[PDB]
Amino acid sequence: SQQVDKIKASYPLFLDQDYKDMLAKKRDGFEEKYPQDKIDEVFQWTTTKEYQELNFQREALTVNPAKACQPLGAVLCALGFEKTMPYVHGSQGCVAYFRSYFNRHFREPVSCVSDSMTEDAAVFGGQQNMKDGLQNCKATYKPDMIAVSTTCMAEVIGDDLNAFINNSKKEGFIPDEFPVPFAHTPSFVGSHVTGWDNMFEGIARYFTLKSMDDKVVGSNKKINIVPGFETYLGNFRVIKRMLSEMGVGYSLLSDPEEVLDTPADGQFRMYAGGTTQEEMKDAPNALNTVLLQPWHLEKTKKFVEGTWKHEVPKLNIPMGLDWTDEFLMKVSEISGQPIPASLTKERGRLVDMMTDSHTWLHGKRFALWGDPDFVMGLVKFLLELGCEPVHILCHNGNKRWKKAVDAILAASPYGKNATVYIGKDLWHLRSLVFTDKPDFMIGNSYGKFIQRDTLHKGKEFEVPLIRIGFPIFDRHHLHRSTTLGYEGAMQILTTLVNSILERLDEETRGMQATDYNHDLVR
Amino acid sequence: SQQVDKIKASYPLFLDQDYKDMLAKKRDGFEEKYPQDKIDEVFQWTTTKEYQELNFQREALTVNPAKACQPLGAVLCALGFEKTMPYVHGSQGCVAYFRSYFNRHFREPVSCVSDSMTEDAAVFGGQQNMKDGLQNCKATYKPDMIAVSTTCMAEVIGDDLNAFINNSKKEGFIPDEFPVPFAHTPSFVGSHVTGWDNMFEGIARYFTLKSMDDKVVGSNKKINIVPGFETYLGNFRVIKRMLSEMGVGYSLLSDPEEVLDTPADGQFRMYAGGTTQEEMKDAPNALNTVLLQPWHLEKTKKFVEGTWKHEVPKLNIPMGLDWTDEFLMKVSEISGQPIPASLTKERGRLVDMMTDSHTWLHGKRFALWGDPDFVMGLVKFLLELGCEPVHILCHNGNKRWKKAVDAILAASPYGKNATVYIGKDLWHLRSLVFTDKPDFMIGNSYGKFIQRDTLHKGKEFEVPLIRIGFPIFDRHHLHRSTTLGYEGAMQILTTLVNSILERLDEETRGMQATDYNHDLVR
Amino acid sequence: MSREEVESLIQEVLEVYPEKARKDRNKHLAVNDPAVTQSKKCIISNKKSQPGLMTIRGCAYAGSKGVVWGPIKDMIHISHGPVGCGQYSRAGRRNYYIGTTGVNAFVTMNFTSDFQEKDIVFGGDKKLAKLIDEVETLFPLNKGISVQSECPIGLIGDDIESVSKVKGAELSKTIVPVRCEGFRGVSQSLGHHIANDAVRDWVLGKRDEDTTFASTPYDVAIIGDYNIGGDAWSSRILLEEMGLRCVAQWSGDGSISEIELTPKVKLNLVHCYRSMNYISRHMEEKYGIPWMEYNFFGPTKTIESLRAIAAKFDESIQKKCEEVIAKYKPEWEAVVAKYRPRLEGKRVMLYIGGLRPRHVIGAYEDLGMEVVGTGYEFAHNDDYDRTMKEMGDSTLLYDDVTGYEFEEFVKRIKPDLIGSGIKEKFIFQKMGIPFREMHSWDYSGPYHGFDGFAIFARDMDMTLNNPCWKKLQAPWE
Amino acid sequence: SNKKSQPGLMTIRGCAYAGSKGVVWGPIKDMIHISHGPVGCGQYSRAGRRNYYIGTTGVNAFVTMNFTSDFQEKDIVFGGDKKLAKLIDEVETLFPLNKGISVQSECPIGLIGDDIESVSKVKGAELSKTIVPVRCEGFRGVSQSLGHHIANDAVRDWVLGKRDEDTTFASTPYDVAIIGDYNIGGDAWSSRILLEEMGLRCVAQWSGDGSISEIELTPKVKLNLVHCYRSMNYISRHMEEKYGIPWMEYNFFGPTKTIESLRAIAAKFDESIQKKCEEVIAKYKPEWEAVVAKYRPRLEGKRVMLRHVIGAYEDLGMEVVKPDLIGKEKFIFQKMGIPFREMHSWDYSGPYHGFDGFAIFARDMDMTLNNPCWKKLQAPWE
Ligand SMILES: C[C@H](CCC(=O)NCCC[N+](C)(C)CC(O)CS(=O)(=O)O)[C@H]1CC[C@H]2[C@@H]3[C@H](O)C[C@@H]4C[C@H](O)CC[C@]4(C)[C@H]3C[C@H](O)[C@]12C
Ligand code: ICS
Ligand code: ICS
Ligand code: CLF
Ligand code: CLF
Ligand SMILES: [Fe+3]
Ligand SMILES: [Fe+3]
């Protein structure tokens, strides 16, 4: 039943008594459900240390991973170039999933095509699929570039991307001068950040490998910036703004912030902004190349150091106070441009907010997860705030990255109770937050489920989630935030301190029970 | 008792069993408390319509007001001028309260002095207080200008500010050339915004009244911007940025964003930025003066139109889509500068966010309160979003402003269930949100108490608070937000939609009870 | 637009395609003629997508794991293969269910083998057995396991059937191997077929020799309703208010016991014909259970379907059906009175997967809105046979439409509203045309039944009449 | 000391209204306090001080509320006595569970010739309710000290003697009152738990978490324990002179001073109270010893620029006097780069008194003094 004046959506329409009785009858009559006391017993068991010991003994089963596959990152990298179509040689279901994922994160159209390889291509390869797809894509969507990645099917059957594209150019399916960079992005190796790295290396190699004779390092007075897999448009914007404030010439390669933030003015723009082909062609002429996320740009680093002869600086992600300072100092040294007074004032204002909020931030325990560079930058910033990152999880991390994060933790008194986990999923993290409860969680929308589980144990056991990372599906326009530089540090600090204060307000809202501490001034 | 490893603050230390027993003994033995059943009965009565009828019959009693006194606004106006020390003629406790209020909101040092008028000055006036205070202030803090306002004591005993300052200059306490603008700011008239208006009018008159002969309108090719009482630094920043993007020469009079956002670099800066005396002197030479908050800048408008001969445009506060568009178009017409493509793209991006969030925003019911211009801008933006501003409360609003807001509401189909209240306080709004429950409240931190009351009636009756306005005391760094322009509209939209989504997530977190709607994607 | 206008528009959109692509796509676009009962004479469907054309079709894994098997709450579904397929499909579909997630329900969880290079090179059968053992260790209250194959499983020569048999015998547990590799077929339709075959082969006949279940003459099963936003619950409450006992309801909020009990029912009520026609026909052939399609979308279709269902039983059920219709008549009449004036004479273009492009038309007509364009991602020719009688005359029909094709159709038709998925929502929002997500109900719902009709009318009004659509042009431009 | 403020210089000193409404009368929870005058004074002091209390706000407790007459021009010109009477009637109507009303005068009340005493007497006789007029006009005096004196005089004249001829209260030889503790973050509760663990009965505790009946019961106790001497010495000496109740100052800041004060208080009673005091000290010794062991090495040798507070700082190994810490001015020292903490006006943390409060105090001192934010004021390129 519905009242036309107050229409109920599924919640709380299904909380009505008739729906409750219907669901109870369905459960009791036909579902053969386990008794509720057995369910409670099993849940309590899953909250225990013995269950955690069994959970961490897993070797073959992955539950609730915190990573994606390579072609997603390859598509994100391809989206950062001007009038460039991401083209995933393989099965179309992969492209449908990639587009849906990026649509849900960015709430914007995501352009990507597939050559629709099927059972026939499983025994003959996808050469005909490549030819037809390249021709159809160029004829239909009129791109300046087509950037080709692979699905797991084409990787398993062993399709040769280079030979397929060369043959497509030979039989006239596409013009011989049309830029078609390619990258093998096996989904069974690494994660989405690995796919971003592979795609960027493929594009850079396509545009620079065979034209290195006329290249002179530092002839265009620019610094190349490689952002890596980045899903905060504010990060691109803050990097560009900080570099422009310093008066430093720069070339941001793979810049998708325009195509992922197109205006609503009555027309659809398939392409917007992006790195030009001339930018990639002139990239070896830069003074140097700075990798914003070095821990998943290793192949790109090898190509840039081996081919462009750029002495890539050893820079951490420009996250937090110390690492933003290091990034700015390195940029100043490379370009010769002094750090302006505006950036000094911005750093001072970030320090001022840190001093203002240190009383609420100090000692807070956090369980965080995400990509390696983002995770380590967050850990460093939390250490700078006096916080304790007790559980540090990176499903796509490696041993060297874990060693670096352990070295960071050992350099701070606030990393004493911190453990770093690599190759562990969010079921492991749920066990960790149940057995060693932190004050808060930091991560993507998936952690919301963990929060639910904690609330099922009790209100005092609930671990609230702070949505920083990728992907964020249950909140709107959080992809416009910044996590890099001083502005990103200020936004992160504000989010953390206000989450703490919101939790304190919720815990002290009980009238005549806990509202003695429901303070107006915090 | 306390555990050294896990120390408890007041919450939840006083929830311990021994503290509970001690408090129960204290209440039962000596407090002579009313029975809890009687307390529940009275609380339930306070939530009824009969209590609302009694509450709205009040004529003499004010409970939990939503306004301050004039000298607070006068101090805020004085802080916006370069090397200017706010000076309140009257009692010291007023200045102590002003400084405490502004420190709590901005979390920054706030400069203000008093002449410490006492019992003796209540008989002979504060002439000697004025002389000594001016001399001591100029000697100790070395300001370039002293802006003088009054407390209620000085306004009751009829202290002549002009005569006192002239006598101080005549007898050598301060130089005759030192700029000492003054304004009478009676705390029993209007509110803090009236004090801001009076102080700005006094400063403008002091710097422009006697030198109007050589003034030519539009000779400096600039537009004067009067922001009014503004407690968001982002609003000053966004106005300046939008005018700089347009290529429009502007003079922002009473600009306090610099002195309220000083960096923490180990040195205390007493003054920072602000409108220079040269800009105030040259203000009559501008093309026109734009009043950002015209509903509390009436005296300023009268002075600017009567003395500067500026045809002040009839502009609403540049809040929300339509009013930001009108402000930009008026600036374009006045200055002759076309609106650039960047501002058009920002408007389109705001519209895109609106289309992305309209499903969650449509039909939501809001009670809201604050200053008149801010309240009407928020109402306009909510009507643009498809929301219902059911309860509109403005303690310092008047009948003409109420008529204007009623006209705004009648122009929209979403203003049908809306009522505007002037001269009502937060107890009236408590009664309103109990008897006519909105989905959310929008106001300053005081509304938190209302939320507590609603939660005492039940979780289904709780009205969550959204902290937009002044003052915000229980959250950190919210004063750095923006409410004006497309950027301010985007920030407000994000806050509203994510508050709705957070409330929905909280309501659907119950495992096997409501978590069927605990959707990962929203 | 007249029929000649639509045909000329189709030709103009096909102009830009290459010869092969244009020739293939010509056969998938048509102008509706309601008198024609054989859609094969005007449209061709269930064919391979043209490479590199930005299609919206999913894979067989999406149609099997994401649609048919995933909503089964008390079962654990393993995305066998690399992490991506399971990660992108985790909790992306709003198959509502009641349960304690992680203990006895696992719908929104992601179980995967997380294939690495060594698993590709040396196979994943041993890893599958170890994973099944670990699942048993860590989730003891699961009532069954399904193994949904991703693309690499069928290419490296893995034998998941033998692993399923051995582990099911060892653990006395139902383990269903589904060969739903994404490259199979052309869309999610083959995934539906493969999942239905797996249901028939491994789950459906489990209680063939069991006669302990007590049956009544009013036993019905709900097949093909996936409880998107609670749609199946809103249909089930109407069915049970009619005097019927809904013994089985899958996949949405479905348990394995309900699937096993389905062969014991008297009637099968198929909501999504496309995804469950195979299992319905098999059950009719084997257990002699009649099946029929019902449409609870909009008060008119809901009333007609309720009367058709009651006609299959005695006079008491028909009397209860009339009682239910009388009880719910004022509610949907009030909803119509409130929302039809705001929605009269507004044209709608739709493009959804395989059922909804024709099923939801009646509710739009209930509100006073006319549908001028419709199409399917993966529907067969029988779906179009059912569609052409529902669509209006000289209306556009598109099969496996491309992004450019549908964009040009929308640009040259100018509808008041468009109903499609998330991959076109923002495309058409940036063009200034109101959009309603017809897959997830735009995170709203349910839309079935009378309560669903109220929610649907409210959503249509709030999106079509939102002020945000009048603000896309800057006043200075 | 205690002289007039120099005009034109910034200072922290409040007014007489702040010392009366904000300090003495406001924490009284079951009374309603009307800020008589314009809106500003009541608005700025609303929930400004963390005088913790237990009650239902708006029903039987009113501490964080703002009751004001909201003076306008007509009230200034023609007086506000009629407005005060109407407001008192409206307060009675809308807040029936209030156990008393105080009227705190703001500045214009003392300048326009308003007679709030006559209104208070008439309305109190009419409604059989205690209405306390306080002439705490802000211009009176040079600081909040005169506000404390005026508020104490009002307490003595209108509340304290309400049960002088009442003997129904059953008294015990271990009856003590806590006078001048305003329960900042629960300080008075942390002191009261220790006092009751000693076998003493705390009949009265005001202003913090204080009720009017407790103030009326104060003249019935055997000992008065004054925390804030400078705000309650007048009432303490009045009770000593009139009722013969001895009073003493207690210092529960830091374990050493807490132990000394507990022993001094127990010395005023029989041997059973002394034995219970020894038991309490023995029970709490390991807790504060562990607190010292954890936090003293992190704070040894640090210099504090600020007895009452010296004891706790010295218990943490800290030197009291380039200060490493200093006990409106907070942000000024904050921007100079010196870590700052309010040792007696803290607006966020607490309690700091008693053994339970000592742990919080040590944690807060370690948190503020050793926070990395103070090491980052200088940019590495400067
Ligand atoms: C019963 C209660 C008085 C309590 C009392 O004073 N008891 C006598 C005092 C003695 N005790 C009970 C407090 C202690 C004992 O003596 C215990 S014993 O004698 O040892 O058993 C009176 C006083 C205040 C009254 C409410 C308010 O007006 C608001 C409202 C107005 C409407 O128009 C009618 C409803 C409302 C809710 C009223 C209901 C009720 O009418 C209240 C609670
Ligand atoms: S199963 Fe099919 S695409 Fe019949 S794969 Fe798809 S929950 Fe669609 S038009 Mo998403 S054949 Fe169901 C469908 Fe229809 S996921 Fe849902 S809405 S009625
Ligand atoms: S009464 Fe005094 S200024 Fe002793 S006027 Fe002041 S609640 Fe301070 S240092 Mo605010 S002599 Fe109390 C005080 Fe101390 S208001 Fe509180 S913190 S212990
Ligand atoms: S068509 Fe379908 S979704 Fe595609 S892979 Fe194949 S079953 Fe799966 Fe999977 S991990 Fe990523 S998303 Fe693919 S490239 Fe492989
Ligand atoms: S010293 Fe004290 S706080 Fe000052 S007025 Fe006097 S009692 Fe009050 Fe009041 S409304 Fe504003 S803040 Fe004043 S100017 Fe008057
Ligand atoms: Fe968008
Ligand atoms: Fe600050």
What 3 state SS string does B223-271 have?
Answer: EEEECCCCCCHHHHHHHHHHHHHCCCCEEECCCCCCCCCCCCCCCCCCC
Q: Are A150 and A94 in contact (CB under 8 A)?
A: no
**Pairwise CA distance, residues D90 & D85, whole Å:** 9
**Pairwise CA distance, residues B171 & B127, whole Å:** 12
**Minimal-distance CA residue of chain B relative to A353:** B477
Please list the residues that pair with C418 across neighbouring strands.
Answer: C349, C435
- For chain C, how many residues are written? 477
Residue nearest to atom 8 of ligand 1 (CA): B34
DSSP A264: -
Residue C276, Cα to own-chain centre: how many angstroms? 10
**Pairwise CA distance, residues A462 & B505, whole Å:** 14
A511–D64 CB contact, under 8 Å: no
- Number of Cβ within a 10 Å radius of residue A6: 6
Determine phi and psi for D254, rounding to 5 degrees.
90, 145
Binding residues of D for [7Fe-Mo-9S-C-homocitryl] cluster: 228, 344
Closest ligand 5 atom to D44 CA: 12
Q: Where are the alpha helices (DSSP H) in C172-272?
A: 188-199, 231-241, 256-261
Size of interface A-D (CB pairs under 8 A): 77
Chains near A, with 3+ CB pairs < 8 A?
B, C, D
Interval between CA C54 and ligand 4 midpoint (Å): 16
Q: Are B508 and A11 in contact (CB under 8 A)?
A: yes
> Six-digit token pair at D195?
């006092």
Nearest to B30 among D48, D60, D204 (CB): D204
Q: Are A327 and A219 in contact (CB under 8 A)?
A: no
**Pairwise CA distance, residues A269 & A266, whole Å:** 10
Give the DSSP H/E element, type plus range, for residue D369: helix D354-369
Which distant-in-sequence residues (6+ apart) come within 8 Å of C103 by Cβ? Answer: A39, A42, A43, A46, C139, C141
Please list the residues that pair with D57 across neighbouring strands.
Answer: D61
State the angle between helix axes of D255-266 and D354-369 in degrees (0 to 180), rounded to the nearest 10. 160
Interval between CA B38 and ligand 1 midpoint (Å): 6
Q: Pairing mode, if any, of strands B419-422 and D67-68? A: unpaired
Closest ligand 1 atom to B38 CA: 43
Which distant-in-sequence residues (6+ apart) come within 8 Å of B518 by Cβ? Answer: A448, A449, A452, B505, B508, B509
**In degrees, to the nearest 5, what angle opens at C-alpha D102 toward C-alphas D98 and D106?**
140
Q: How far is CA A406 from CA A321, A376, A416, B248, in A?
A: 19, 10, 10, 53
Q: In a 10 Å sphere around its CB, with 0-12 CB exposed, 13-18 middle and 19+ buried, how is residue A63 labelled?
A: buried
| DSSP annotation string for D303-367 | EEE---SHHHHHHTT-EE---SEE--HHHHHHHTT--B--SSS-SS----SHHHHHHHHHHHHHH
Residue to mutate, A67, A94, A119, ligand 4, most ligand atoms under 8 Å from C-beta: A94
Residue nearest to atom 2 of ligand 4 (CA): C182
Q: Do chains A and D touch (3 or more CB pairs under 8 A)?
A: yes
State the angle between helix axes of B192-208 and B298-306 in degrees (0 to 180), rounded to the nearest 10. 20
Q: Where are the alpha helices (DSSP H) in A81-191?
A: 92-106, 121-124, 127-141, 152-157, 161-170
> Six-digit token pair at C296?
């609870």
Q: Which of A465, A468, A495 is nearest to A360 (CA)?
A: A495
Binding residues of D for [8Fe-7S] cluster: 15, 41, 107
> Ligand 4 in contact with A186 (CB < 6 A)?
no
- Coil, strand or helix: which one is B358? helix
Which distant-in-sequence residues (6+ apart) come within 8 Å of C410 by Cβ? Answer: C349, C418, C428, C431, C433
Give chain A's end-to-end CA distance (angstroms, integer). Answer: 45
User: Which amino acid type is present at position C263?
Assistant: P
- For chain D, how many residues are written? 382
Residue C464, Cα to own-chain centre: how many angstroms? 24
Q: Which of A473, A298, A445, A463 is nearest to A370 (CA)?
A: A445
> Ligand 4 in contact with A68 (CB < 6 A)?
no
Give the DSSP H/E element, type plus range, for residue B420: strand B419-422
DSSP D22: I
Buried b (16+ CB within 10 A) or exposed e, B411-428: ebebbeebebbbbbbbbb
Interval between CA A111 and ligand 5 midpoint (Å): 63
- Coil, strand or helix: which one is B365? strand
C462–B362 CB contact, under 8 Å: yes
Domain-wise residue ranges, chain C: 1-59+342-476, 60-202, 203-317
Report the side by side order of strands in the sheet with B419-422.
Answer: B419-422, B388-394, B365-369, B440-443, B465-467
Q: How far is CA A325 from CA A322, C211, C344, in A?
A: 5, 75, 61
- For chain B, how many residues are written? 522
Residues of D near A (Cβ–Cβ under 8 Å) read 46-48, 50, 52-57, 64, 186, 334-335, 347-349, 363-364, 367-368, 371-374, 376-377, 379-382
> Six-digit token pair at C404?
């450019």
- Number of Cβ within a 10 Å radius of residue C40: 12
Rg (CA), chain A: 25
Flag whether residue A511 sits within 8 Å of chain B, measured between CB atoms: yes
How many CA within 13 A on the CB side of residue D57? 33
Which distant-in-sequence residues (6+ apart) come within 8 Å of A265 by Cβ? Answer: B344, B348, B351, C430, C472, C473, C474
- For chain A, how many residues are written? 522
Report the side by side order of strands in the sheet with B288-291.
Answer: B250-252, B223-226, B288-291
> Ligand 3 in contact with D144 (CB < 6 A)?
yes
Size of interface B-D (CB pairs under 8 A): 304
Q: How far is CA A464 from CA A501, B8, C63, C219, C277, in A?
A: 12, 19, 34, 45, 45
State the angle between helix axes of B399-410 and B372-384 in degrees (0 to 180), rounded to the nearest 10. 0
Interval between CA D345 and ligand 3 midpoint (Å): 7
Nearest to C100 among B351, B511, B517 (CB): B511
Domain-wise residue ranges, chain A: 69-214, 215-319, 320-363+484-522, 364-469
Which residue numbers of D are catalytic? 15, 18, 49, 148
- Number of Cβ within a 10 Å radius of residue D252: 30
Q: In a 10 Å sphere around its CB, with 0-12 CB exposed, 13-18 middle and 19+ buried, how is residue A175 labelled?
A: exposed
Ligand nearest to the CA of B37: 1
Give the DSSP H/E element, type plus range, for residue A193: helix A192-208
- A123 among known catalytic residues: no
**Pairwise CA distance, residues A463 & A366, whole Å:** 9
Q: Are A239 and A259 in contact (CB under 8 A)?
A: no
DSSP A211: G
Q: Are A352 and A377 in contact (CB under 8 A)?
A: no
Q: How far is CA A241 from CA A245, A487, B348, C242, in A?
A: 6, 11, 21, 66
State the angle between helix axes of A341-361 and A320-335 in degrees (0 to 180), rounded to the nearest 10. 170
Please list the residues that pair with D206 across neighbouring strands.
Answer: D179
Nearest to A344 among D54, D376, D382 (CB): D382
Q: Which of A268, D169, B34, B517 is nearest to C54 (CA)?
A: A268
| DSSP annotation string for A3-58 | -SSS--BHHHHTTSHHHHHHHHHHIIIII-PPPHHHHHHHHHHHTSHHHHHHHTT-
What 3 state SS string does B287-301 have?
Answer: CEEEECCHHHCHHHH
Interval between CA A118 and ligand 4 midpoint (Å): 12
**Pairwise CA distance, residues A427 & A110, whole Å:** 30
Residue for token pair 């003697």: D161
Chains near C, with 3+ CB pairs < 8 A?
A, B
Q: Are C397 and C28 in contact (CB under 8 A)?
A: no
Please list the residues that pair with C397 across neighbouring strands.
Answer: C30, C374
Interval between CA B488 and ligand 7 midpoint (Å): 22
**Pairwise CA distance, residues C174 & C183, whole Å:** 26
Flag whether residue A349 sits within 8 Å of chain B, measured between CB atoms: yes
Q: Are D75 and D106 in contact (CB under 8 A)?
A: no
What 3 state SS string does B208-224 have?
Answer: HHHHCCCCCCCCCCCEE
**Pairwise CA distance, residues D5 & C392, whole Å:** 88
**Pairwise CA distance, residues B375 & A280, whole Å:** 50
**Pairwise CA distance, residues C392 & C384, whole Å:** 13
- Number of Cβ within a 10 Å radius of residue C169: 10
Q: Which of D224, D247, D199, D365 is nearest to D297 (CA)?
A: D365
Q: Are C71 and C90 in contact (CB under 8 A)?
A: no
Residue C303, Cα to own-chain centre: how many angstroms? 22
**Pairwise CA distance, residues B265 & D373, whole Å:** 11
**In degrees, to the nearest 5, what angle opens at C-alpha A257 toward C-alphas A252 and A263?**
145
How many CA within 13 A on the CB side of residue B132? 15
**Pairwise CA distance, residues A320 & A483, whole Å:** 8
Q: Which of B283, B299, B69, B294 is nearest to B198 (CA)?
A: B299
> Six-digit token pair at A87?
């083209």
Q: Which of D270, D294, D371 is nearest to D325 (CA)?
A: D371
Closest ligand 1 atom to B35 CA: 13
- Number of Cβ within a 10 Å radius of residue A342: 11
**Pairwise CA distance, residues B476 & B484, whole Å:** 20
Q: Pairing mode, if any, of strands A62-63 and C111-112? A: antiparallel
Quote the minimal CA–CA distance from B331 to chain C in Å. Answer: 12
Q: Which of A150, A151, A103, A214 is nearest to A471 (CA)?
A: A103
- Coil, strand or helix: which one is C249? strand
Nearest to D56 among A325, A354, A511 (CB): A511
Measured between beta carbons, the chain B residues lying within 8 angstroms of C477 are: 344
**Pairwise CA distance, residues B315 & B332, whole Å:** 13
- Coil, strand or helix: which one is C181? coil
Largest Cα span, chain A: 82
Q: Are C437 and C425 in contact (CB under 8 A)?
A: yes
- Number of Cβ within a 10 Å radius of residue B514: 17
- Coil, strand or helix: which one is A367? strand
Q: Are C55 and A92 in contact (CB under 8 A)?
A: yes
**Pairwise CA distance, residues D72 & C29, whole Å:** 76
| DSSP annotation string for B473-508 | -SSSSGGG---SHHHHHHHHHHHHHHHHHHHHHHHT
Q: Which of D201, D351, D194 is nearest to B14 (CA)?
A: D351
> Six-digit token pair at B374?
């801010």
Q: Are B105 and B231 in contact (CB under 8 A)?
A: yes
Breaks (C-N over 2.5 A) in chain B follow: none
Q: Which of D49, D44, D51, D48 is nearest to D27 (CA)?
A: D51
B325–C474 CB contact, under 8 Å: yes
Which distant-in-sequence residues (6+ apart) come within 8 Å of D262 by Cβ? Answer: D194, D198, D277, D280, D281
Q: Which of D327, D332, D324, D331 is nearest to D375 (CA)?
A: D324
**Pairwise CA distance, residues D44 & D14, whole Å:** 12
- Number of Cβ within a 10 Å radius of residue B121: 24
Nearest to D50 among A355, A358, A519 (CB): A519
Rg (CA), chain D: 22
> Six-digit token pair at C472?
């896309």
**Pairwise CA distance, residues A448 & A128, whole Å:** 44
Q: Are B149 and B75 in contact (CB under 8 A)?
A: yes
Q: Which of A353, A230, A223 is nearest to A293 (CA)?
A: A230
What 3 state SS string does A50-108 have?
Answer: HHHHHHCCCCCCEECCCCCCHHHHHHHHHCCECCEEEEEECCHHHHHHHHHHHHHHHCC
| DSSP annotation string for C74-139 | TSEEEEES-HHHHHHTTT-S-B---S-BTTTB-TT--EE----HHHHHH-SHHHHHHHHHHHHHH-
Q: Are C339 and C367 in contact (CB under 8 A)?
A: yes
> Six-digit token pair at D230?
């400078």
